[PDB]
């Protein structure tokens, strides 16, 4: 319903970062009304890097 595609992935990278992950679709307990979860990640992008 939200993304059309099922076998999805998210890929992010820089000159030093190489990260790829896929969603985990599974039954989970509801927290604040939602059985879904968001996973956050972070990096530091250096100067002039893309």
């Amino acid at each position, epitope marked *: *319903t*939200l993304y059309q595609n099922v076998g999805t992935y998210v890929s992010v990278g820089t000159s030093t970062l190489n990260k790829r992950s896929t969603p985990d679709i599974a*039954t989970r307990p*509801k927290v604040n*009304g*939602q*059985g*879904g979860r968001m996973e956050f990640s972070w990096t530091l992008l250096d100067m002039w890097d893309t």
Partner: antibody, heavy 122, light 107 residues
Framework: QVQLQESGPGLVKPSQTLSLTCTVS??????????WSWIRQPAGEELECLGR???????NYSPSLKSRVTISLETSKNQFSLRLNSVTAADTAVYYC??????????????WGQGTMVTVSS | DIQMTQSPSSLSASVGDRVTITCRAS??????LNWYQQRSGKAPRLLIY???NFQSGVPSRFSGSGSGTDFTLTISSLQPEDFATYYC?????????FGGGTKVEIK
């Protein structure tokens, strides 16, 4: 495939209690990011939300009905039910069982039952 | 609470005609407007779940558009299968209200 099946039709008198039970099949009522609601449709009129119950037990009822209507969740039977107290002639309508999708960006009634007619009269 | 307006109340069309239905919110509801197709004697069926996003099984001829306060449901080419009352619903607010309903009639 999930289906919603309402209990049969009938006639009640004014000041009686309306009682409709929706049997959910094809999955558990406590399984996903869903909510159940009852939608009323007086013949010839617009669809009206009577109220909603969330899979987690939280409820919301419409202002004209909340002093009279209760919606409850029975996990052991995969059933939901609508109880409307103090019925009047104006409550004659088709009552539908519906499954809403509680996805953040998407909020809609995905599965509808067939609709049960309830008549209220003297 | 947000008041809904929907028009035409009815419109006839021939099979093969382009048909557009307009739904207006008194206040912005962002993209949270869905659409349903109700056939007489049957429960409403979901066509559009967010503006422009249609439900699986819904013919490609049904295309939503718009934003905020002004939305359109377009049937690119009307079929014999589409003589139905169409409803829009604003799910932004706590009261998930519906518009008046637009009847597509046979010409």
């Amino acid at each position: 495939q999930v289906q919603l099946q309402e209990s049969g039709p009938g006639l009640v008198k004014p000041s009686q209690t309306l009682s409709l039970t929706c049997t959910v099949s094809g999955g558990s009522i406590s399984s996903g990011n869903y909510y159940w609601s009852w939608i009323r449709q007086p013949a010839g009129e617009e669809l009206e939300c009577l109220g909603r119950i969330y899979t987690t037990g939280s409820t919301n009822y419409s202002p004209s009905l909340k002093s009279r209507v209760t919606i409850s969740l029975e996990t052991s039977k995969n059933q939901f039910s609508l109880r409307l107290n103090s019925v009047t002639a104006a409550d004659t309508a088709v009552y539908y069982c519906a499954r809403g999708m509680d996805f953040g960006p998407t909020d809609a009634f995905d599965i509808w039952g067939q609709g049960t007619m309830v008549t209220v009269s003297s | 609470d947000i008041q809904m307006t929907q028009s035409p109340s009815s419109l006839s069309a021939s099979v093969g005609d382009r048909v557009t239905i307009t739904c207006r919110a008194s206040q912005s509801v962002s993209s949270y407007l869905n659409w349903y197709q109700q056939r007489s004697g049957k429960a409403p069926r979901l066509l559009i779940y967010t503006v422009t996003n249609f439900q699986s099984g819904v013919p490609s001829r049904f295309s939503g558009s718009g934003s905020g306060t002004d939305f359109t449901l377009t049937i690119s080419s009307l079929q014999p299968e589409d003589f139905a009352t169409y409803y829009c619903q604003e799910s932004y607010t706590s009261r998930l209200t519906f518009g008046g309903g637009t009847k597509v009639e046979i010409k």
